[PDB]
Amino acid sequence: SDKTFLENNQYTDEGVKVYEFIFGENYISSGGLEATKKILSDIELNENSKVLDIGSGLGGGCMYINEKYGAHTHGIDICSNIVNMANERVSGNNKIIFEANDILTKEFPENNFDLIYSRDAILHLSLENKNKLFQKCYKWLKPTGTLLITDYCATEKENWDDEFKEYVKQRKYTLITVEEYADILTACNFKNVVSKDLSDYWNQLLEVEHKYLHENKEEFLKLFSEKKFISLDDGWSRKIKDSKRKMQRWGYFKATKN
Ligand SMILES: Nc1ncnc2c1ncn2[C@@H]1O[C@H](CSCC[C@H](N)C(=O)O)[C@@H](O)[C@H]1O
Ligand SMILES: CCN(CC)Cc1cc(Nc2ccnc3cc(Cl)ccc23)ccc1O
Numbered sequence: 079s080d081k082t083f084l085e086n087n088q089y090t091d092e093g094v095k096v097y098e099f100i101f102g103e104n105y106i107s108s109g110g111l112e113a114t115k116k117i118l119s120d121i122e123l124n125e126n127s128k129v130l131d132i133g134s135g136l137g138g139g140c141m142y143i144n145e146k147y148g149a150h151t152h153g154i155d156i157c158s159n160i161v162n163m164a165n166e167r168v169s170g171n172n173k174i175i176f177e178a179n180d181i182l183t184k185e186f187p188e189n190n191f192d193l194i195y196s197r198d199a200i201l202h203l204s205l206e207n208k209n210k211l212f213q214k215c216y217k218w219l220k221p222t223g224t225l226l227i228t229d230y231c232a233t234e235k236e237n238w239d240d241e242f243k244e245y246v247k248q249r250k251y252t253l254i255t256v257e258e259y260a261d262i263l264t265a266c267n268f269k270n271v272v273s274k275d276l277s278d279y280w281n282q283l284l285e286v287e288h289k290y291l292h293e294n295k296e297e298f299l300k301l302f303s304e305k306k307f308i309s310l311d312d313g314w315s316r317k318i319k320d321s322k323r324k325m326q327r328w329g330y331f332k333a334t335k336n
């Protein structure tokens with residue numbers, strides 16, 4: 079599937095390390111540890127709780143959830159190179175496992191998890207694939223369970239410019255509106271569906287990251303190339319510009335089963 083594509087483009091080892099430089103250790107998405115603390119601030123779990131992280135990446139989210147709650151965390155990520163990196167950071171901790179697998183082919187028992195959690199990963203999935211995932215997610219949640227998601231969203235396609243279309247095409251993203259996304263969750267039988275466009279906050283995160291990149295660019299070049307620097311600088315500039323003009327949006331979704 080998109081495995082070899084992702085492993086050999088956006089999520090190369092070098093690419094992942096660059097992301098870590100800007101998001102912080104163990105994170106490859108928006109706001110790293112700080113945003114994660116915010117996203118989980120109203121979430122209640124204990125040591126016996128069971129957590130699924132969809133697209134767990136370098137594992138920072140699972141580590142934080144286990145650190146904060148003592149919960150059992152199980153991360154699934156389709157990139158084997160990323161999974162291997164994550165595994166090497168949690169070798170001592172038996173309540174944190176990662177597994178290399180497409181979440182779509184992954185099989186789980188019904189009523190399994192207290193929390194199903196995903197941060198900026200579901201944008202990789204086609205529209206059809208987003209639907210079957212959430213139906214599988216519904217099954218997997220215990221009756222007392224919560225689904226918790228951040229994901230890239232967008233304005234309708236008639237408002238995309240050429241550059242945004244090209245970015246979405248070459249990254250093989252499928253981006254829908256916050257409303258279209260919320261619609262899928264209700265269609266997949268979830269209750270208490272809560273949707274928020276967090277683009278103002280996302281823009282603040284991107285700004286901190288962008289400033290941080292420039293402030294620490296000497297340390298950056300010590301580890302990476304000037305080519306990788308320009309590319310990253312350029313990409314953040316565009317995400318900042320596009321969230322400002324409401325073209326690219328950051329969706330937050332929180333839902334239950336009953
Ligand atoms: N079909 C799929 N199944 C499982 N993981 C997938 C997937 N499609 C994309 N991914 C993964 O989703 C991750 C998105 S990047 C963000 C990773 C992590 N949630 C964090 O915030 O740091 C990537 O590591 C990618 O490999
Ligand atoms: C290298 C690791 N760093 C980047 C500077 C992580 C990181 C921190 C931030 N800072 C912040 C995140 C969330 N809330 C914040 C609130 C305030 Cl008043 C200040 C900084 C915040 C933003 C993005 C980001 O990626």
Ligand SMILES: CCN(CC)Cc1cc(Nc2ccnc3cc(Cl)ccc23)ccc1O
Binds near residue numbers: 240244245312316320
């Ligand atoms: C000459 C100008 N061209 C180069 C071919 C610039 C150009 C950049 C892009 N890259 C991008 C456009 C919008 N958002 C982006 C976000 C990120 Cl994280 C990275 C690249 C982006 C796409 C098409 C395009 O034509």
